[PDB]
Amino acid sequence: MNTVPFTSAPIEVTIGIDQYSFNVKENQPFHGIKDIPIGHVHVIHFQHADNSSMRYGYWFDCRMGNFYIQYDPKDGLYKMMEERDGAKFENIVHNFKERQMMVSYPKIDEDDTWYNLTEFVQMDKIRKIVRKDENQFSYVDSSMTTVQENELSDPAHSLNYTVINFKSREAIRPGHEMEDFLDKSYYLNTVMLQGIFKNSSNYFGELQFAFLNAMFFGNYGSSLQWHAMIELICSSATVPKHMLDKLDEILYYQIKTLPEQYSDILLNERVWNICLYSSFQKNSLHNTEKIMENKYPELL
Amino acid sequence: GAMNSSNYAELFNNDIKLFVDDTNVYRVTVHKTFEGNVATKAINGCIFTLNPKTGHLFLKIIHTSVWAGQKRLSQLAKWKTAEEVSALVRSLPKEEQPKQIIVTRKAMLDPLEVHMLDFPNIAIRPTELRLPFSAAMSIDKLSDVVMKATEPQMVLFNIYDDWLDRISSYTAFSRLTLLLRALKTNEESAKMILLSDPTITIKSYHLWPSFTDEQWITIESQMRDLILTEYGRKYNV
């Protein structure tokens, strides 16, 4: 089990670690988070008490280095940083642990929620969507725009999600206009899966990452990507059995985890009604349809 | 975006544009079968593609053979309309290609947009105007060429005959829409009004009678009165 120590907490902030969150008061003797499960990506995220504007955070994997948080009073945020000196790091953590100034990643043993939300999400793929090659960890926030959002303004601070556009030459083969528009199977199976993602694992990884950025940061562009990647599958008449079965499980845990009070802004009525009731796959998402109907029957 | 009453004059400016109407593409007669079920028999159709400035009408006849062994024909009809409009634009020289295509029904937007991906600089627009282009098949010579077709065929007309020699395209368009609105409301009455005086004829190379300026004013008045009469019937007002 791994640790993200904090230098200090000089400003009152709500700290997220994955699906958990703790309020820390201005100058509270908080020195970090211990017992973080090895084997998954994690996100550590922040909402300042005095300006709830810009939720922001860091995607990281503790197998890839020793990471700590330090408040920068110039840029006014909690920053992730890598400690290259292994012995210094182990010694900082040991001191804070012995003084019990660290909160415990509060994982329930039966609870597979985080695994289920990050099953296909890999740090290497995150670092290609969020480009900042000098760091092993990835910054995301509320206001960052997607490559696609910018096409329709600072390129280095963009989310480089795969562009999906149902009315693009990429989506539509010459002479198969009606076929490809009403049945997106060629765009999903040849262009996206075989062409760009290489396999359904990379496709689900991006879909899951897009959801988590939508949920944790209210990132609007990430919400658009998650819906697009769902709609591309649901709008395809030909999808491998294993992908449909996996998709039902993925969306199930996403809907289960979503804050109940956020379904108004995070869920797109048109996409969900279309995916569950009208599409080719309207009968292939049993688990997802049962939770959506019991938890968000207003949306439908 | 959407074409309406406010931006009406734009139809007659010097930017090439076409109206597309798909209402006569897929046409059927509904009938009873021997077992007492209902069946449709398709008849020849047409795409109505009109330059409102010049009067140039590209009448693409849709032969019943294009439906043979196809399913969901009302859906296919929108895609076949978009395919044919796309083929017409590609067949025109660059300086003849439209800068805008206005569809008279919103269900045409996606099919036309997906067929015109190759022309990202051609704007595909809906309209809020209720245009009477459905009534094109009430023009005897257009109806005749559609029904006699034995294969797919493009026929070129000028729907304004020689009117632009004497009037503007604004006035020519207003005359055309009033004639078509009348034909659509009361075909029998409208056609009676247009042939009432047997001395006025339709030239072999024309669609409408050869009315003098004064006879057009009379005809236009009769068409307006026909439209109010019919209106004070549908609604009893």
UniProtKB/Swiss-Prot annotation, chain A:
Modified residues (Phosphothreonine): 257
Region (Leucine-zipper): 244-265
CDD domains listed in its UniProt record: Aar2_C, Aar2_N
Example of a GO cellular component annotation carried by this entry: U5 snRNP
Keyword Nucleus part of the UniProt annotation: yes
Pfam family, one: AAR2_1st
Positions of post-translational Phosphoserine modification: 236
GO BP terms, alphabetized: spliceosomal snRNP assembly; spliceosomal tri-snRNP complex assembly
Record carries keyword Cytoplasm: yes
Keywords per UniProt: Cytoplasm, mRNA processing, mRNA splicing, Nucleus, Phosphoprotein
Cell compartment(s), UniProt: Cytoplasm; Nucleus
Post-translational modification: Phosphorylated on serine and tyrosine residues.
General remark: Present with 7330 molecules/cell in log phase SD medium.
Subunit description: Heterodimer. Interacts with PRP8 (via RNase H homology domain and MPN domain), competing with BRR2 for the same binding site. Component of a U5 snRNP complex that contains at least the U5 snRNA, PRP8, SNU114, AAR2, SMB1, SMD1, SMD2, SMD3, SME1, SMX2 and SMX3, but is not a component of the U4/U6-U5 tri-snRNP complex.
Role this protein plays: Component of the U5 snRNP complex that is required for spliceosome assembly and for pre-mRNA splicing. Involved in splicing pre-mRNA of the A1 cistron and other genes that are important for cell growth.
Similarity comment text for this entry: Belongs to the AAR2 family.
The protein, known as: A1 cistron-splicing factor AAR2
Organism: Saccharomyces cerevisiae (strain ATCC 204508 / S288c)
Classification of source organism: Eukaryota, Fungi, Dikarya, Ascomycota, Saccharomycotina
From Swiss-Prot, chain B:
Start and end residues of each stretch annotated as RNase H homology domain: 7-237
Compartment annotation: Nucleus
Effect of residue 105 to K: Severely impaired growth. Reduced growth at 30 degrees Celsius. Strongly reduced growth at 16 degrees Celsius
Domain topic, free-text comment: The MPN (JAB/Mov34) domain has structural similarity with deubiquitinating enzymes, but lacks the residues that would bind the catalytic metal ion. Contains a region with structural similarity to reverse transcriptase, presenting the classical thumb, fingers and palm architecture, but lacks enzyme activity, since the essential metal-binding residues are not conserved.
Leftover remarks: Present with 468 molecules/cell in log phase SD medium.
Subunit structure: Component of the U4/U6-U5 tri-snRNP complex composed of the U4, U6 and U5 snRNAs and at least PRP3, PRP4, PRP6, PRP8, PRP18, PRP31, PRP38, SNU13, SNU23, SNU66, SNU114, SPP381, SMB1, SMD1, SMD2, SMD3, SMX2, SMX3, LSM2, LSM3, LSM4, LSM5, LSM6, LSM7, LSM8, BRR2 and DIB1.
Protein name (record): Pre-mRNA-splicing factor 8
Organism per entry: Saccharomyces cerevisiae (strain ATCC 204508 / S288c) (Baker's yeast)
Protein encoded by which gene: PRP8
